[PDB]
Write a protein that binds this ligand. Structure first.
Ligand SMILES: Nc1ccn([C@@H]2O[C@H](COP(=O)(O)O)[C@@H](O)[C@H]2O)c(=O)n1
Ligand SMILES: Nc1ccn([C@@H]2O[C@H](COP(=O)(O)O)[C@@H](O)[C@H]2O)c(=O)n1
Lengths: 394, 394
């Protein structure tokens, strides 16, 4: 009974999942958080954080690998899937990892210095500890590679694009790809003749316009920073306003990049929390700045959902997904009420239902556009790619 | 037969118009270009650029004033209208200029250092040369002041808004106000129950969502830089991509602000021209980068028109205006074809017609949204404000 080992080897931590091939369901999931810092620990299923301190990426994965053998699961690992942050222009689909692939990941790595090098560390580790196991690289940008130049060009001098690689790449590709696939079945649509908007709201937040099965426009830019306002990310911001701030308070570009990543977004406007559940409660208890942050949040999503609709010949579906997307009854409704212009009528009985109801329609019949909630499963999509690439012979 | 003197006293030049009160039509128009530079000149009606060299704002207006008396027009100046770039939060409508008003303009002037101080120079001049003439200040932001906080807040720390004044202000207010007013009559709509999108495409480019006679969302930000890609302005740009560029090529924020204002936009992608007529011809003659620049240009407009529609309960009209908006048969159509999703069908016979046809419908009957061209008249709107404020007693 073979299994797929999924790895999101981020900068600060190493997340992992062990999916069964037969069911595509998680048998085991863990995390190696606080990496390289004096005390690094491994928390599998959340039962006991074993302090594997004084250790790096190579041994943290060797700690996870030993625990797989503790559960007699090592011998059953047929495939390993690696989540990669940035594919650049070089990667349009998931690939079997060879030396050539490692090189090409290393080539585009300047575009995501924090994430990509951390991903490569995890690739080497898994390659070392499991050499006779087929390994797959799944990229977080590759879905958005179907974008036409008018969709991905910035209004900068052409040289910044041709020699340096400055363009729109977009992120949450795997999520957007997964959810879109699921929507065709749920909504009973023809992939070859369809237009969807997918709102991935959660950790980061992004919108994708999926036309006839292809990503044609997406909210995020070169960095995960452009687009929607997020938990701690500012979203769309006037560069003139930024340059003004840098002059008025005398801050370096380095200062502001840290401000826009860590101090901004929902956290920034509310001055309270980056967490929705806290801000939803905060508003319910007469907090204006938490209410404002949500109202702004909802507005920018509503702006980008309608915006991205332009890249469709027809609008069949708006799909909510991700932590906030799947669970927030409020945000979903405020967003939809904001889009009455698109002819949306929302069934509030259906919108009430918690996430346990999984893939569900949430718009009433008179609606000209079908709204739905689809739980995102990046782990399942990574596995499916790996299983598919498993049958191939390289 | 009284007249209104309109002044756009920009940083580099001083434009002016002399409108008749009875007709609201231009009797005289000129420009004092290349200000303060060794050779400054005055070109009235474009007949003879008289080199009033070695001179500043106070004497350039004194050169225009003498030429008004040369045409026995000085004694007939009942009102003077000043175009102001940035009103800040302090100005929501046009006002009669008093000392208090001068102060308040001087207060918000840090927000537009290039433009506002140039505007104040022209106010002092006109005040000096015409002391017994009522003068009106018309602000380029004041129309957009009806925006709700969720529409104008950036996802930055709240402090940047409350103490420093960093928010969305928007521009082309006077144009957006004028055109919207004209649309109600042209489209035979009820102002109190209407939703319009106005695309001001020309010099700079901006979109405004006008709901029930009020500006509820607009493309430009704190600076005229945010929003649509423009002639030499980049438009919406990822801050992460900007910060990346500053690292990769080692450029100061000052460098990039100059790059994004002067070297970017249509000029940047094409590497040829910031002028549409040149780029339209260039594409017609197999130039890919000029074609790409236009395709990108059209796409971003299509993105923002659909985007701004979200802030409406209903979409009745899309209105094209400004240099590019009124004259470009191509751009208008490419934009509308991009918005087939909103249910637009375009009458190409009507879209063919040149600007001489003035205020015209350009969408066919089966269209769910009325498209129209309305020539913008900032001069006429400034005059109308002044005439109105002329009847008031301060
Ligand atoms: N019941 C829940 C669960 C999560 N959430 C929100 O979803 C977000 C988590 O998103 P991800 O899991 O995609 O990172 C958190 O910001 C949290 O506030 C919520 O608003 N209601
Ligand atoms: N017939 C015309 C006239 C002007 N234009 C464009 O309109 C723009 C001028 O806009 P403004 O007058 O608003 O500054 C120029 O970029 C020019 O290329 C055009 O494309 N066709």
């Amino acid at each position: 009974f073979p299994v797929v080992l999924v790895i999101n080897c981020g900068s600060s931590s190493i997340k992992f999942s062990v999916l069964d091939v037969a069911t595509c369901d998680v048998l085991m999931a863990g995390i190696a958080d606080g990496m390289n810092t004096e005390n690094a620990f491994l928390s599998i299923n959340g039962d006991k954080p074993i302090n594997l301190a004084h250790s790096n990426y190579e041994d943290a994965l060797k700690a996870i690998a030993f625990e797989l053998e503790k559960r007699d699961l090592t011998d059953s690992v047929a495939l390993i899937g690696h989540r990669i942050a940035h594919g650049g222009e070089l990667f349009t689909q998931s690939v079997i990892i060879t030396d050539e692939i490692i090189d090409n990941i290393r080539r585009v790595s300047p575009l995501a210095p924090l994430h990509n090098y951390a991903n490569l560390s995890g690739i080497d580790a898994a390659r070392h500890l499991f050499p006779a196991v087929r390994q797959v690289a799944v990229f977080d940008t590759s879905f958005h590679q179907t974008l036409a130049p008018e969709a991905y060009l910035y209004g900068l001098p052409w040289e910044y694009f041709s020699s340096l690689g400055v363009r729109r790449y977009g992120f949450h590709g795997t999520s957007h790809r997964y959810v879109s696939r699921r929507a065709y079945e749920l909504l009973d649509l023809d992939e070859k003749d369809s237009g969807l908007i997918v709102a991935h709201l959660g950790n980061g937040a992004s919108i994708c316009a999926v036309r006839n099965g292809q990503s044609v426009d997406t909210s995020m830019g070169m960095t995960p920073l452009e687009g929607l306002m997020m938990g701690t990310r500012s979203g769309d911001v006037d560069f003139g306003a930024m340059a003004w701030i840098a002059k008025e308070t005398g801050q370096t570009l380095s200062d502001l990049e840290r401000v826009v990543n860590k101090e901004s977004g929902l956290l920034g406007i509310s001055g309270l929390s980056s967490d929705l559940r806290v801000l939803e409660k905060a508003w319910h208890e007469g907090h204006e700045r938490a209410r404002l942050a949500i109202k702004t949040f909802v507005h920018r999503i509503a702006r980008h959902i309608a915006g991205h609709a332009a890249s469709l010949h027809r609008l069949d579906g708006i799909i909510f997904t991700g932590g906030i997307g799947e669970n927030s009854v409020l945000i979903r409704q405020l967003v939809i009420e904001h889009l009455g212009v698109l002819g949306l009528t929302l069934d509030v009985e259906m919108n009430k239902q918690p996430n346990s109801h999984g893939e569900r329609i949430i718009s009433a019949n008179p609606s000209q556009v079908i709204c739905a909630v689809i739980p995102t499963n990046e782990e399942k999509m990574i596995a499916l790619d790996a299983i598919h690439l498993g049958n191939v012979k390289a």
